[PDB]
Amino acid sequence: ASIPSSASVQLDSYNYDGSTFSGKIYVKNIAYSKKVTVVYADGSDNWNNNGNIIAASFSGPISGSNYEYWTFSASVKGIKEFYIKYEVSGKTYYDNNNSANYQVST
Ligand SMILES: OC[C@H]1O[C@@H]2O[C@H]3[C@H](O)[C@@H](O)[C@@H](O[C@H]4[C@H](O)[C@@H](O)[C@@H](O[C@H]5[C@H](O)[C@@H](O)[C@@H](O[C@H]6[C@H](O)[C@@H](O)[C@@H](O[C@H]7[C@H](O)[C@@H](O)[C@@H](O[C@H]8[C@H](O)[C@@H](O)[C@@H](O[C@H]1[C@H](O)[C@H]2O)O[C@@H]8CO)O[C@@H]7CO)O[C@@H]6CO)O[C@@H]5CO)O[C@@H]4CO)O[C@@H]3CO
Ligand SMILES: [Zn+2]
């Protein structure tokens, strides 16, 4: 994925080897204090009231743009799909892959 044009948060890429779920995320540097979480459905596509979460952390700047990189990695029992949540300055933004969410393979 290329840098987003206006979205506040947008997955860049993700990886899954059947045990470890990891990835890189584009985050618009709106304010200093940020919270970026990855919310997923389990091997049984159960969301658990948005309770299966992975906290992402600052990874590094992106020269010449108003975005920066955040990464995440975690072992998960199983996963069917996921979306990203971004909280900053009292507002909440999301990356739900045009409301289809990101579907994971195997
Ligand atoms: O005393 C320092 C500081 O202490 C407290 O802040 C803590 C905070 O409460 C915790 O949440 C945590 O902060 C984490 C943060 O929430 C995460 O989002 C992430 O932050 C990364 C950013 O996402 C990323 O963008 C980058 O940050 C760069 C900024 O975007 C860029 O603007 C610039 O920052 C400058 C500030 O804009 C400017 O105001 C000035 O900052 C000073 C503050 O004004 C002053 O209040 C104080 O800050 C307190 C804070 O209020 C407490 O709550 O001192 C600041 C001086 O350092 O100057 C900044 C220039 O340095 O540049 C930064 C890059 O440096 O990277 C960050 C970090 O990777 O992760 C955060 C850390 O986990 O922890 C902090 C304490 O470390
Ligand atoms: Zn990309």
Side-chain angles (χ1 to χ4, degrees), residues 85-98:
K85 180 181 187 173
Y86 175 27
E87 296 161 285
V88 62
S89 294
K91 295 193 190 297
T92 298
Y93 306 97
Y94 301 85
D95 175 18
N96 60 39
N97 188 44
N98 290 302

PDB file of all heavy atoms in Angstrom, residues 85-98:
ATOM      1  N   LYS A  85      -8.126   0.326  14.703  1.00  0.00           N
ATOM      2  CA  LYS A  85      -8.763   1.433  15.408  1.00  0.00           C
ATOM      3  C   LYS A  85      -7.685   2.431  15.805  1.00  0.00           C
ATOM      4  O   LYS A  85      -6.643   2.038  16.312  1.00  0.00           O
ATOM      5  CB  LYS A  85      -9.500   0.915  16.647  1.00  0.00           C
ATOM      6  CG  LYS A  85     -10.204   2.004  17.453  1.00  0.00           C
ATOM      7  CD  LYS A  85     -10.879   1.350  18.675  1.00  0.00           C
ATOM      8  CE  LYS A  85     -11.762   2.338  19.440  1.00  0.00           C
ATOM      9  NZ  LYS A  85     -12.548   1.612  20.527  1.00  0.00           N
ATOM     10  N   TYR A  86      -7.941   3.717  15.575  1.00  0.00           N
ATOM     11  CA  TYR A  86      -6.969   4.748  15.883  1.00  0.00           C
ATOM     12  C   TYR A  86      -7.636   5.827  16.738  1.00  0.00           C
ATOM     13  O   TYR A  86      -8.599   6.454  16.289  1.00  0.00           O
ATOM     14  CB  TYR A  86      -6.455   5.343  14.568  1.00  0.00           C
ATOM     15  CG  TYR A  86      -5.524   6.528  14.693  1.00  0.00           C
ATOM     16  CD1 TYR A  86      -4.723   6.710  15.820  1.00  0.00           C
ATOM     17  CD2 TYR A  86      -5.400   7.443  13.652  1.00  0.00           C
ATOM     18  CE1 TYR A  86      -3.815   7.775  15.904  1.00  0.00           C
ATOM     19  CE2 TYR A  86      -4.500   8.504  13.724  1.00  0.00           C
ATOM     20  CZ  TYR A  86      -3.712   8.662  14.850  1.00  0.00           C
ATOM     21  OH  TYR A  86      -2.814   9.702  14.900  1.00  0.00           O
ATOM     22  N   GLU A  87      -7.133   6.017  17.961  1.00  0.00           N
ATOM     23  CA  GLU A  87      -7.693   7.033  18.868  1.00  0.00           C
ATOM     24  C   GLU A  87      -6.678   8.143  19.113  1.00  0.00           C
ATOM     25  O   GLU A  87      -5.544   7.890  19.535  1.00  0.00           O
ATOM     26  CB  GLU A  87      -8.093   6.387  20.195  1.00  0.00           C
ATOM     27  CG  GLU A  87      -9.230   5.355  20.057  1.00  0.00           C
ATOM     28  CD  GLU A  87      -9.338   4.395  21.232  1.00  0.00           C
ATOM     29  OE1 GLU A  87      -8.503   3.467  21.362  1.00  0.00           O
ATOM     30  OE2 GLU A  87     -10.268   4.559  22.047  1.00  0.00           O
ATOM     31  N   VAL A  88      -7.084   9.377  18.832  1.00  0.00           N
ATOM     32  CA  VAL A  88      -6.205  10.525  19.026  1.00  0.00           C
ATOM     33  C   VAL A  88      -7.027  11.805  19.171  1.00  0.00           C
ATOM     34  O   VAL A  88      -8.028  11.999  18.477  1.00  0.00           O
ATOM     35  CB  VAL A  88      -5.190  10.676  17.840  1.00  0.00           C
ATOM     36  CG1 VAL A  88      -5.912  10.928  16.528  1.00  0.00           C
ATOM     37  CG2 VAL A  88      -4.216  11.791  18.128  1.00  0.00           C
ATOM     38  N   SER A  89      -6.609  12.664  20.095  1.00  0.00           N
ATOM     39  CA  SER A  89      -7.291  13.933  20.334  1.00  0.00           C
ATOM     40  C   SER A  89      -8.804  13.826  20.514  1.00  0.00           C
ATOM     41  O   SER A  89      -9.551  14.634  19.974  1.00  0.00           O
ATOM     42  CB  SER A  89      -6.986  14.913  19.205  1.00  0.00           C
ATOM     43  OG  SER A  89      -5.616  15.273  19.212  1.00  0.00           O
ATOM     44  N   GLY A  90      -9.250  12.838  21.279  1.00  0.00           N
ATOM     45  CA  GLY A  90     -10.672  12.691  21.525  1.00  0.00           C
ATOM     46  C   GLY A  90     -11.502  12.111  20.393  1.00  0.00           C
ATOM     47  O   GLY A  90     -12.690  11.859  20.568  1.00  0.00           O
ATOM     48  N   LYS A  91     -10.883  11.897  19.234  1.00  0.00           N
ATOM     49  CA  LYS A  91     -11.594  11.337  18.093  1.00  0.00           C
ATOM     50  C   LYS A  91     -11.104   9.919  17.803  1.00  0.00           C
ATOM     51  O   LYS A  91      -9.981   9.557  18.170  1.00  0.00           O
ATOM     52  CB  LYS A  91     -11.412  12.246  16.864  1.00  0.00           C
ATOM     53  CG  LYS A  91     -12.047  13.634  17.053  1.00  0.00           C
ATOM     54  CD  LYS A  91     -12.154  14.413  15.758  1.00  0.00           C
ATOM     55  CE  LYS A  91     -12.571  15.876  16.014  1.00  0.00           C
ATOM     56  NZ  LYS A  91     -13.930  16.020  16.627  1.00  0.00           N
ATOM     57  N   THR A  92     -11.953   9.129  17.150  1.00  0.00           N
ATOM     58  CA  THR A  92     -11.628   7.743  16.805  1.00  0.00           C
ATOM     59  C   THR A  92     -11.734   7.528  15.295  1.00  0.00           C
ATOM     60  O   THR A  92     -12.693   7.975  14.683  1.00  0.00           O
ATOM     61  CB  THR A  92     -12.601   6.765  17.498  1.00  0.00           C
ATOM     62  OG1 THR A  92     -12.485   6.888  18.922  1.00  0.00           O
ATOM     63  CG2 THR A  92     -12.300   5.322  17.097  1.00  0.00           C
ATOM     64  N   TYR A  93     -10.744   6.867  14.694  1.00  0.00           N
ATOM     65  CA  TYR A  93     -10.762   6.594  13.257  1.00  0.00           C
ATOM     66  C   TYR A  93     -10.552   5.097  13.058  1.00  0.00           C
ATOM     67  O   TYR A  93     -10.040   4.413  13.945  1.00  0.00           O
ATOM     68  CB  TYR A  93      -9.648   7.356  12.535  1.00  0.00           C
ATOM     69  CG  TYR A  93      -9.648   8.845  12.806  1.00  0.00           C
ATOM     70  CD1 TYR A  93      -8.813   9.390  13.778  1.00  0.00           C
ATOM     71  CD2 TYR A  93     -10.497   9.702  12.108  1.00  0.00           C
ATOM     72  CE1 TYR A  93      -8.821  10.754  14.056  1.00  0.00           C
ATOM     73  CE2 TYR A  93     -10.512  11.078  12.373  1.00  0.00           C
ATOM     74  CZ  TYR A  93      -9.674  11.591  13.347  1.00  0.00           C
ATOM     75  OH  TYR A  93      -9.680  12.939  13.625  1.00  0.00           O
ATOM     76  N   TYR A  94     -10.910   4.577  11.889  1.00  0.00           N
ATOM     77  CA  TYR A  94     -10.734   3.137  11.675  1.00  0.00           C
ATOM     78  C   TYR A  94     -10.269   2.754  10.285  1.00  0.00           C
ATOM     79  O   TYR A  94     -10.473   3.519   9.326  1.00  0.00           O
ATOM     80  CB  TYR A  94     -12.072   2.399  11.841  1.00  0.00           C
ATOM     81  CG  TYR A  94     -12.777   2.519  13.175  1.00  0.00           C
ATOM     82  CD1 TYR A  94     -13.611   3.598  13.425  1.00  0.00           C
ATOM     83  CD2 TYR A  94     -12.671   1.547  14.153  1.00  0.00           C
ATOM     84  CE1 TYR A  94     -14.300   3.720  14.623  1.00  0.00           C
ATOM     85  CE2 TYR A  94     -13.352   1.661  15.364  1.00  0.00           C
ATOM     86  CZ  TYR A  94     -14.167   2.756  15.583  1.00  0.00           C
ATOM     87  OH  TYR A  94     -14.861   2.898  16.768  1.00  0.00           O
ATOM     88  N   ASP A  95      -9.697   1.568  10.138  1.00  0.00           N
ATOM     89  CA  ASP A  95      -9.421   1.028   8.804  1.00  0.00           C
ATOM     90  C   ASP A  95     -10.110  -0.351   8.749  1.00  0.00           C
ATOM     91  O   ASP A  95      -9.612  -1.356   9.296  1.00  0.00           O
ATOM     92  CB  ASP A  95      -7.923   1.006   8.477  1.00  0.00           C
ATOM     93  CG  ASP A  95      -7.551   0.341   7.141  1.00  0.00           C
ATOM     94  OD1 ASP A  95      -8.391   0.150   6.236  1.00  0.00           O
ATOM     95  OD2 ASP A  95      -6.358   0.006   6.995  1.00  0.00           O
ATOM     96  N   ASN A  96     -11.272  -0.344   8.143  1.00  0.00           N
ATOM     97  CA  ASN A  96     -12.085  -1.542   8.006  1.00  0.00           C
ATOM     98  C   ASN A  96     -12.134  -2.096   6.581  1.00  0.00           C
ATOM     99  O   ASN A  96     -13.052  -2.816   6.178  1.00  0.00           O
ATOM    100  CB  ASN A  96     -13.491  -1.278   8.608  1.00  0.00           C
ATOM    101  CG  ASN A  96     -14.265  -0.136   7.946  1.00  0.00           C
ATOM    102  OD1 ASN A  96     -14.258   0.066   6.723  1.00  0.00           O
ATOM    103  ND2 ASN A  96     -14.993   0.616   8.756  1.00  0.00           N
ATOM    104  N   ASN A  97     -11.096  -1.772   5.805  1.00  0.00           N
ATOM    105  CA  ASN A  97     -11.011  -2.261   4.440  1.00  0.00           C
ATOM    106  C   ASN A  97     -12.355  -2.098   3.723  1.00  0.00           C
ATOM    107  O   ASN A  97     -12.990  -3.075   3.289  1.00  0.00           O
ATOM    108  CB  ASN A  97     -10.590  -3.740   4.432  1.00  0.00           C
ATOM    109  CG  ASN A  97     -10.303  -4.260   3.022  1.00  0.00           C
ATOM    110  OD1 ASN A  97      -9.653  -3.587   2.227  1.00  0.00           O
ATOM    111  ND2 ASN A  97     -10.770  -5.469   2.724  1.00  0.00           N
ATOM    112  N   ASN A  98     -12.786  -0.846   3.616  1.00  0.00           N
ATOM    113  CA  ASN A  98     -14.054  -0.521   2.966  1.00  0.00           C
ATOM    114  C   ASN A  98     -15.209  -1.412   3.436  1.00  0.00           C
ATOM    115  O   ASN A  98     -15.968  -2.008   2.654  1.00  0.00           O
ATOM    116  CB  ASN A  98     -13.853  -0.548   1.447  1.00  0.00           C
ATOM    117  CG  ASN A  98     -12.975   0.618   0.955  1.00  0.00           C
ATOM    118  OD1 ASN A  98     -13.299   1.798   1.173  1.00  0.00           O
ATOM    119  ND2 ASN A  98     -11.869   0.295   0.294  1.00  0.00           N
TER     120      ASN A  98
END
